[PDB]
């Protein structure tokens, strides 16, 4: 049986850690909601 626990407020944080790149990927989405890469 699944249960929920509060973890925080939803707010923008000034000066948060900035990481990650911005890739442009060609993808396909199937009936089961699964993405796959089209290359």
């Amino acid at each position: 049986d699944m249960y929920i626990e509060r973890a925080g407020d939803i707010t923008w944080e000034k000066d948060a850690e900035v990481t990650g790149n911005s890739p442009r990927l060609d993808v396909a989405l199937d009936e089961s909601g699964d993405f796959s890469l089209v290359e």
């Binding site: 049986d1 699944m2 249960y3 929920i4 626990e5 509060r6 973890a7 925080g8 407020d9 939803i10 707010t11 923008w12 944080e13 948060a16 850690e17 900035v18 990481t19 990650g20 790149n21 911005s22 890739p23 442009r24 990927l25 060609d26 993808v27 396909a28 989405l29 009936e31 089961s32 909601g33 993405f35 796959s36 890469l37």
Partner: protein, 156 residues
């Protein structure tokens, strides 16, 4: 149980100890998460029960107690923050510039941040603190790391 707006962990006592299967957003008395987190099962909040209201396996979204309320969208230009809630770890905001998933039905924002699968359902925010989508449905690239779509539902 607790119905205060905010981010929540989705836990299960079915496996060894207490396991985090995902995350969700409580907004306007409705709990929003990804379909693959709960598979549409009922949830408990304290002594109260949350029943599914709407869901779709292809969008990979589900709402409890009422219809999907989140409708903010990534503007296509600005940075965003993933409010990551990883298993056993404190909620932390991570800022990033989204990439793009190009599909036959249009483009969608994507966040290139890799976290354990039990982080699925963590909200992605704009600079006003509005939830523009949830993190946790995407693809595995050459490196073995994850790139998630910014998945948003429709507010009827």
């Amino acid at each position: 149980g607790e119905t205060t707006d905010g981010v929540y962990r989705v836990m299960t006592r079915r496996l060894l100890g207490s396991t985090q299967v995902g995350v969700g957003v409580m907004q306007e008395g409705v709990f929003h998460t990804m379909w693959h987190v709960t598979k549409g099962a009922a949830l408990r909040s304290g002594e109260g029960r949350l029943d599914p209201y709407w869901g779709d396996v292809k969008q990979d979204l589900v709402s409890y107690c009422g219809p999907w309320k989140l409708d903010a969208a990534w503007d296509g230009l600005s940075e965003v923050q993933l409010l990551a809630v990883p298993p056993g770890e404190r909620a932390k905001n991570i800022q990033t510039l989204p990439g793009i998933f190009k599909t036959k039905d249009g483009d969608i924002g994507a966040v290139a941040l890799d976290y354990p699968a039990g982080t699925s359902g963590s909200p992605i925010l704009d600079k006003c603190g509005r939830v523009i989508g949830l993190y946790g449905n995407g693809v595995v690239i050459k490196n073995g790391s994850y790139v998630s779509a910014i998945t948003q539902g429709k507010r009827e």
